[PDB]
Amino acid sequence: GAITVLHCELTAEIGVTDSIVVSSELVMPYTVGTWLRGVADNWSKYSWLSVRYTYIPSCPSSTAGSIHMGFQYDMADTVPVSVNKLSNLRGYVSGQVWSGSAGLCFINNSRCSDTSTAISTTLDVSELGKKWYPYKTSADYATAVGVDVNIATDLVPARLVIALLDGSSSTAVAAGRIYDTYTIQMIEPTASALNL
Amino acid sequence: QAGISMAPSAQGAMVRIRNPAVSSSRGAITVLHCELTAEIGVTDSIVVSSELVMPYTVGTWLRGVADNWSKYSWLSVRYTYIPSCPSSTAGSIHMGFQYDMADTVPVSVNKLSNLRGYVSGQVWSGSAGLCFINNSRCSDTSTAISTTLDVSELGKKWYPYKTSADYATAVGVDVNIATDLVPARLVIALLDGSSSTAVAAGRIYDTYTIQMIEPTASALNL
Amino acid sequence: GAITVLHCELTAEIGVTDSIVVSSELVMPYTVGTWLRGVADNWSKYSWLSVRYTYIPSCPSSTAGSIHMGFQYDMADTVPVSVNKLSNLRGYVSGQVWSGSAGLCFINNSRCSDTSTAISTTLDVSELGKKWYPYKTSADYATAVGVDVNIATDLVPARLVIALLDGSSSTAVAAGRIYDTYTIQMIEPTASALNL
Amino acid sequence: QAGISMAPSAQGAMVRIRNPAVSSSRGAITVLHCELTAEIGVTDSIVVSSELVMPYTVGTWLRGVADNWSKYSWLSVRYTYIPSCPSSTAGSIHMGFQYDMADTVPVSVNKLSNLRGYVSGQVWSGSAGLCFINNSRCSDTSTAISTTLDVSELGKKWYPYKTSADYATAVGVDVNIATDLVPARLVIALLDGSSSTAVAAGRIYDTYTIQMIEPTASALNL
Ligand SMILES: [Ca+2]
Ligand SMILES: [Ca+2]
Ligand SMILES: [Ca+2]
Ligand SMILES: [Ca+2]
Ligand SMILES: [Ca+2]
Ligand SMILES: [Ca+2]
């Protein structure tokens, strides 16, 4: 009954400016990437076997700026407001917007050489609070969270906080992209139209 | 000697709490400690009280330490009653656990007696449970008024660190939102006393071992 | 130049009521007890080699109530408001107002048998923040502390917080006494009249 | 090869902070950790900045953990600069320590150069200090812009945990009241830049080992 998918897809496009810009992505099928969003909808519940976010650069070596990533686990906790608080989170990694190429091996599965320079981080699936979560659409999530954020705890495993700053322009400059590489188990099918 | 007992005039128990034991394994950090948790007084009518078993409310020290981590798991939680009155004092204490915050709090020792971890005892006894708090070698704990959480049968393993404030708000929307945040609550009942006015009986100490994971600046933790 | 005194004297008389009453004593010569207060004044500075507070009972076995003691080290920190907070402090010990007799051996130096029942606690002289403190009169201390409590840090090593409650009367009932047993080193003499 | 150097277009350093190490010995509890401490930017004119080296201000995590203990002692404190700009960026960074809060903050790299622990470096270099933060095995740290506190020469061993608020008030009465509360302050100067407007240069990470003693409920700690 468990049907397993392994895949790496574009999860977010990154631009860097001269000011801190904190953003976050829920670590659930619907938000992880559009491809998964579409396939996972045909199933009622899932379990993350492995989730790794890897940043791959697209800018010139002359591009100033740094990216910082880390995880949060209680949606009710406040999202880091400074890059300082961010550095306290689990899974913190911080790189420079033009580096990270060695991480490419995580995206195309070829054998990785030295990945100490890859700006990549992974989710601690075993310390998550439950193994089988329900597939949620961001819309429905939003509504729930609107009543009380604590309703999110039963619905989503974690949140990926990203921070970009130290750039040189007041206007966004294309830095790179964050790709997500996951192994997921999907169970109990459903027509997607009913999945909220 | 078998079958004989002598009621003392008063029991004595010298509580001496040792330094908290903290240590980080790989991923998980573990704390072990004891804290005075509640004060107790009896009356002639029954009075039921409850205490949520979550870091924030279990103890004043724990509250501030646990806040630096995102989630936790109880390895062990024990409540022990230590008396502070003479054997001439009337009254009895009763404890037990409830696990669905929406359930009604017991209104009688009869209902109470059916709960998990139920224990009763004269308001003037229980010094035998001292070894649990003091950390000494336990002798005959046969007459101790102490109970413990059935951690393996709890709803889930990892719970999020919550502040009473945020919890209180959640629960205000619907009490069932609590199920996802707190594992259980200790219920305490006292009756069989002689004054219509409360008479100090004793106090309850909490001894726990908790596992904490995934760090976060405290200020962000709600 | 170091002149050493060892002595045990009455430091405080204790009464118990049906409500919590928190009090505190600065762990300095002047407040530790009147005898020491008077002799230590003839010296400019001192160092605590050992300080132990022991409660000895004077009431009937039928006396309800408990005493709780513990130490604080930054005079600026708030004094415990509940017996709960008090139980978090270093050196916490809590006994029942009629017990503690075994502690008598600390007061008259006779060989102690089993002191596990003595309501006694000691000061961690080695973790104090300095070894030689100046002799201060409570008056002068008060003034300093009035400008800013932080001025106390340079003047006093610690504070003994005491809490009495669980009694049976709204009116104080004589429970016992706290005696202090110390070894102190006094240096650099002075006429006492000048010592503030 | 001896005597030859090649300036890169840009240096890269992948920071990855590991789990805090906490453990209780007998009396003392020890923490070891790294936290991002400050953000850096250069201008064409000199700009001096300072950071007190006390738990509250050293790091956002430390701040909340250390608060559960009454006093502390620094076993080690190191500040390491990691760049985030290209080798074409103009600017230099300078660090050093001051120990009497009443002293005037330096107003020039000349005065600054005389301080204890002085270090200078191009605003675009310093990746060699990464091993200090990442905890890797250090290779040639010859070109790292990192400095450390001379803990043995500090004023006293055990300092009280203080909140910036209470500290700020004390210091407001007289700055000399600080001497009794804080061991030293890091001074940071940046100049030699090219814009009148700040240009992001890099950031500073703090790596420390602290000993904490005599527990207290956090709420009481000021
Ligand atoms: Ca659940
Ligand atoms: Ca669904
Ligand atoms: Ca939380
Ligand atoms: Ca001093
Ligand atoms: Ca004097
Ligand atoms: Ca303090």
Give residue ranges of B with CB < 8 Å to any A CB.
27, 70-71, 156-162, 166, 169-170, 173, 177, 180-181, 213-217, 219-222
Contact at CB, A93 and D37, closer than 8 angstroms:
no
The token duo for C11 is: 């430091």
Nearest by CB to D21, which of B24, B63, B65?
B24
Nearest by CB to C150, which of D157, D180, D221?
D180
DSSP structural state of residue C116? T
Whose CA is closest to B212, among B64, B103, B94, B52? Answer: B64
∠ CA B49-B50-B52, rounded to 5°: 165
Backbone region of residue A102 per phi and psi (left: phi > 0; alpha: psi in -120 to 50; beta: other values)? alpha
Contact D93, D40 (CB under 8 A): yes
- At B49, the amino acid letter reads S
Q: Which DSSP string do the residues of A50-61 spell out, in sequence order?
A: EEEEEEEE-S-T
In angstroms, the Cα distances linking C1 to C43, C49, C126 are: 11, 16, 21
Angstroms from B16 CA to nearest CA on chain A: 35
Ligand nearest to the CA of D157: 4
Whose CA is closest to C182, among C55, C3, C49? Answer: C49
Mutate to test the interface with B, among C87, C89, C127, C161 (most CBs of B within 10 A): C87
CA–CA distance, A194 with B87 (Å, rounded to integer): 67
Residues whose CB is less than 8 angstroms from the CB of residue B148 and which lie 6 or more positions away in sequence, other chains included: B76, B77, B78, B79, B117
DSSP structural state of residue B59? -
Neighbouring residues of the ion ligand 1, judged by CB less than 5 Å: A 154; B 180
Nearest by CB to D215, which of B20, B68, B217?
B20
D81 annotated ligand binder:
no
CA–CA distance, A16 with A171 (Å, rounded to integer): 8
- Neighboring chain B residues of D22 at a CB cutoff of 8 Å: 22-24, 29
Whose CA is closest to D197, among D44, D88, D51? Answer: D44
For residue C44, the CA-to-ligand 5 centroid distance in Å is: 6
Contact at CB, B200 and C65, closer than 8 angstroms:
yes
Chains that contact B by 3+ CB pairs under 8 Å? A, C, D
| Domain with C32 in it | 1-196
For residue C89, the CA-to-ligand 4 centroid distance in Å is: 23
- Neighboring chain D residues of A124 at a CB cutoff of 8 Å: none
Nearest by CB to C168, which of B17, B34, B199?
B199
- Neighboring chain A residues of B69 at a CB cutoff of 8 Å: none
Please name the residue of chain A whose CA is at the shortest distance from the CA of residue D87. A62
For residue D170, the CA-to-ligand 5 centroid distance in Å is: 23
CA–CA distance, D55 with D71 (Å, rounded to integer): 10
- At B169, the amino acid letter reads T
Which technique was used to obtain these atomic coordinates?
X-ray
Contact at CB, C79 and D220, closer than 8 angstroms:
yes
Please name the residue of chain D whose CA is at the shortest distance from the CA of residue C149. D170
Whose CA is closest to A16, among D8, D200, D16, D197? Answer: D200
Contact A68, A83 (CB under 8 A): yes
Contact at CB, B86 and C61, closer than 8 angstroms:
yes
Nearest by CB to B215, which of D20, D24, D29?
D20
Q: Which DSSP string do the residues of C2-70 spell out, in sequence order?
A: -EEEEEEEEEEEEEE-SS-EEEEEESSHHHH-HHHHHHHTTEEEEEEEEEEEEEEE-S-TT---EEEEE
CA–CA distance, B61 with B172 (Å, rounded to integer): 26
Q: What are phi and psi of B107, to 5 degrees?
A: -125, 15
Ligand nearest to the CA of C137: 5
DSSP structural state of residue C76? T
The token duo for B196 is: 């219509």
∠ CA B202-B206-B212, rounded to 5°: 165
For residue C180, the CA-to-ligand 5 centroid distance in Å is: 22
Count of residues in chain D: 222
Contact at CB, A83 and D199, closer than 8 angstroms:
no
Contact at CB, D61 and B67, closer than 8 angstroms:
no
- At C111, the amino acid letter reads R
Which alpha helices (DSSP H) does B72-183 contain, by range? 109-113, 130-134, 164-173
Angstroms from B52 CA to nearest CA on chain A: 17
> Dihedral angle at the C-alpha atoms of B37, C158, B130, B189, nearest 10 degrees?
-20
- Neighboring chain C residues of B81 at a CB cutoff of 8 Å: none
CA–CA distance, D174 with D172 (Å, rounded to integer): 5
For residue A132, the CA-to-ligand 3 centroid distance in Å is: 21
Nearest by CB to D86, which of A62, A85, A94?
A62
Chains that contact A by 3+ CB pairs under 8 Å? B, D
Contact at CB, B16 and C93, closer than 8 angstroms:
yes
Q: What is the CATH number of the domain that holds C154?
A: 2.60.120.20
Q: What are phi and psi of D128, to 5 degrees?
A: -65, -15
Contact at CB, C166 and B89, closer than 8 angstroms:
no
Angstroms from C47 CA to nearest CA on chain B: 26
A133 annotated ligand binder:
no
Angstroms from C84 CA to nearest CA on chain B: 5
The token duo for A79 is: 């999202």
Using CA of residue B82, residue B87, residue B89, residue B95, what is the dihedral sign? positive
Contact B185, B98 (CB under 8 A): yes
Angstroms from B151 CA to nearest CA on chain D: 25
CA–CA distance, D60 with A179 (Å, rounded to integer): 30
Radius of gyration over every alpha carbon of chain D, rounded to an integer in angstroms: 18
CA A82 to chain centre: 19
The token duo for A116 is: 């100490």
In angstroms, the Cα distances linking D121 to C114, C191, D96, D124, D192 are: 65, 59, 13, 8, 11
CA–CA distance, B185 with B169 (Å, rounded to integer): 18
SS3 content of chain B, % helix, strand, coil (to 5): 20, 35, 45
- Neighboring chain B residues of C90 at a CB cutoff of 8 Å: 19
Give residue ranges of D with CB < 8 Å to any C CB.
27, 70-71, 156-162, 166, 169-170, 173, 177, 180-181, 213-217, 219-222
Whose CA is closest to B190, among B53, B96, B86? Answer: B96
Interface B-D, measured as beta-carbon pairs within 8 A, has a size of 58
Residues whose CB is less than 8 angstroms from the CB of residue D2 and which lie 6 or more positions away in sequence, other chains included: none
CA–CA distance, B30 with B66 (Å, rounded to integer): 10
DSSP structural state of residue B53? -
Angstroms from B93 CA to nearest CA on chain C: 16
Contact B215, A88 (CB under 8 A): yes
D208 annotated ligand binder:
no
CA–CA distance, C94 with C64 (Å, rounded to integer): 14
- Neighboring chain A residues of B54 at a CB cutoff of 8 Å: none
Whose CA is closest to A186, among A74, A19, A39? Answer: A39
Contact B35, B60 (CB under 8 A): yes
CA–CA distance, C31 with C38 (Å, rounded to integer): 10
The number of domains in chain A is 1
Please name the residue of chain B whose CA is at the shortest distance from the CA of residue C100. B14
Please name the residue of chain D whose CA is at the shortest distance from the CA of residue B35. D217
A148 annotated ligand binder:
no
For residue C46, the CA-to-ligand 4 centroid distance in Å is: 14
For residue D160, the CA-to-ligand 6 centroid distance in Å is: 5
Instruction: Count the helices and strands in chain B (H runs, E runs).
Output: 5, 10
Angstroms from C136 CA to nearest CA on chain D: 17
The token duo for A5 is: 């998918």
SS3 for A127? helix
Beta-bridge partner residues of C48:
C184
For residue C154, the CA-to-ligand 4 centroid distance in Å is: 5
Contact A185, A29 (CB under 8 A): no
Using CA of residue C150, residue C156, residue C158, residue C163, what is the dihedral sign? negative
CA–CA distance, A85 with B219 (Å, rounded to integer): 9
CA–CA distance, A58 with B2 (Å, rounded to integer): 85
Contact at CB, C168 and B36, closer than 8 angstroms:
no
